[PDB]
């Protein structure tokens, strides 16, 4: 179908984070059989292979932003690849990685479909600017490089000179926020970004949360959706092997429901599975659980419904 016509892009990149290890995100997400599982449902999966990220040996912090040139060039490469897989009419399934790659994954996707609406599922806002950041990491600042409303509040970071901010403030919906810094929250409330923090999810139920999300994005006009999932968005009992797990988050069922409701719109046009960190699993079972949850989320984005799926044939024969 026009949906579930996947183009998979590896992104074994971790330099946008503190001392990392998420670069073996694609390796585990694939060795857990993601392509082999996406082919049972009628998906035209094309593996564009793990991106070769050229090395930046001498790459010094900008002011506090750790290793900005590496992240900037990695995201430019990813954006080029994502534009390549979107010109083929596919769904750019960028499985990474860290959100420092979301800058590329959305900037490339917006080169083709300028009017995409982003659904950001993350425990964090990931909206620090290079000025208001505190840890000086770039996994925590991918949205600030994308919002049109933050132009002028984003310094000319080295390596991010190619970034033209693409999404408006009114084209992004946060789901699952439960760990927001004061600067992130000031930016979030000033720009009028629609967000469904954990409190709004508890108040409304995930069903009403997703109904409002889709009526807010796809209400005025049907547009592509770029679900930029982050596995720390789900509760740590389900995804323990992630960078910064925050307790009391979306359950497994709620994550699956988010993805199923996004799929059923049929407008999904890009997906990111970020922050799978198999090095932070206390036990190999924790890594297996995180990877299985990420795989289940990914599959549900592409038609695998919990009620069960059947091919359009007469099974009573």
């Amino acid at each position: 179908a026009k949906s579930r016509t996947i183009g998979i892009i590896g992104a074994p990149f971790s330099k946008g984070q503190p001392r990392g290890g998420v670069e073996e995100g694609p390796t585990v997400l694939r060795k857990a059989g993601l392509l082999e599982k996406l082919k049972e449902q009628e998906c035209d999966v094309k593996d564009y292979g793990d991106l070769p990220f050229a090395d930046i040996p001498n790459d010094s912090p900008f002011q506090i932003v750790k290793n900005p040139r590496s992240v900037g060039k990695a995201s430019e490469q990813l954006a080029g690849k994502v534009a390549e897989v979107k010109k083929n009419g596919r769904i750019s399934l960028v499985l990474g990685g860290d959100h420092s790659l979301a800058i590329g994954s959305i900037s490339g996707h917006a080169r083709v479909h300028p009017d995409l609406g982003v659904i950001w599922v993350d425990a964090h806002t990931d909206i620090n600017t290079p000025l208001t950041t505190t840890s000086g990491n770039l996994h925590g600042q991918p949205v600030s490089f994308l919002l049109k409303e933050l132009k002028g509040k984003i310094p000319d970071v080295p390596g991010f000179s190619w970034v033209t901010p693409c999404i408006s403030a009114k084209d992004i919906v946060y789901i699952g926020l439960r760990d927001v810094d004061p600067g992130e929250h000031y930016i979030l409330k000033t720009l009028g970004i629609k967000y469904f923090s954990m409190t709004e999810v508890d108040r409304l139920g995930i069903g009403k949360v997703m109904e409002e999300t889709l009526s807010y994005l796809l209400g005025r006009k049907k547009r592509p959706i770029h679900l930029s999932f982050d596995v720390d968005g789900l509760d740590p009992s389900f995804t323990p092997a992630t960078g910064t797990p925050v307790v009391g988050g979306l359950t497994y069922r709620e994550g699956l429901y988010i993805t199923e409701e996004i799929y059923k719109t049929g407008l999904l046009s890009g997906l990111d599975i970020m922050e799978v960190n198999p090095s932070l699993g206390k036990t190999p079972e924790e890594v297996t659980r995180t990877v299985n949850t990420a795989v289940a989320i990914t599959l549900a984005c592409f038609g695998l419904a919990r009620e069960g799926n059947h091919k359009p044939i007469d099974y009573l024969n």
Partner: antibody, heavy 123, light 108 residues
């Protein structure tokens, strides 16, 4: 000042076992990604295996895959490497090397090295 | 795996004339190649970080280059205090296998 002092065995005749060590000092240990390389005397080097700032992405060369294991103790600054079922071709001088930069981000070269622990395996 | 092959398994050019070691790899490693120098009886010091990168303190003679599958390491002038064995790291996720080496020497 960035000494990688190596310790451990050096004489095991049978297919026995050893556990080397590399008492690192000078740098923040739980930040860099330490590795182990071997060098048979007068021969080329060979990457034995490597680990993270944490321990958990231990990758091994496809010659010691099922035999060696690296542990690491960030609170105590060591680089234990457990060798098991020595195949007597592992008669090399084993170096511990650092990661050349901060993050243990996977791909990194080897800047600072220890030297020694001449493991011989011998009857 | 990825097999790394130093092209000259040993060479001896001159005090003077340039020297070019090649490290054609097996599958594209794409700018993850470190060139070392051992000076036998000591510890290998690193020379070149990502295929050029001229690590600090290394004399500007070494001008390694290349990307993708095959690379080089062009010593502009040999200057016999550079007589040593040079390696080829291939540092990415974790094959990280070196090369055979390259005995470099002079004549008399």
């Amino acid at each position: 000042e960035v000494q990688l002092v190596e310790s451990g065995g050096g004489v095991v005749r049978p297919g026995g076992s050893l556990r080397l060590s590399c008492a690192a000092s000078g740098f923040t240990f739980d930040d860099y990604g330490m590795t182990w390389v071997r060098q048979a005397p007068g021969k080329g080097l060979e990457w034995v295996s490597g680990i993270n700032w944490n321990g958990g992405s231990t990758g091994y060369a496809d010659s010691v895959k099922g035999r060696f294991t690296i542990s690491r103790d960030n609170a105590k600054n060591s680089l234990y490497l457990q060798m098991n079922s020595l195949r007597a071709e592992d008669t090399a001088l084993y170096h511990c090397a650092r990661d050349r930069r901060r993050g243990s981000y996977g791909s990194d070269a080897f800047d600072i090295w220890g030297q020694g622990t001449m493991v011989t395996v011998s009857s | 795996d990825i097999q790394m092959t130093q092209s000259p398994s040993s060479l001896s050019a001159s005090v003077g004339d340039r020297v070019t070691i090649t490290c054609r790899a097996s599958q594209g490693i794409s700018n993850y190649l470190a060139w070392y120098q051992q000076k036998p009886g000591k510890v290998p010091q690193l020379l070149i970080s990502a295929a050029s990168t001229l690590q600090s303190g290394v004399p500007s003679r070494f001008s390694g280059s290349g990307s993708g599958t095959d690379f080089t390491l062009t010593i502009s002038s040999l200057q016999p205090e550079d007589v040593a064995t040079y390696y080829c790291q291939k540092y990415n996720s974790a094959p990280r296998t070196f090369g055979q080496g390259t005995k470099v020497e002079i004549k008399r």
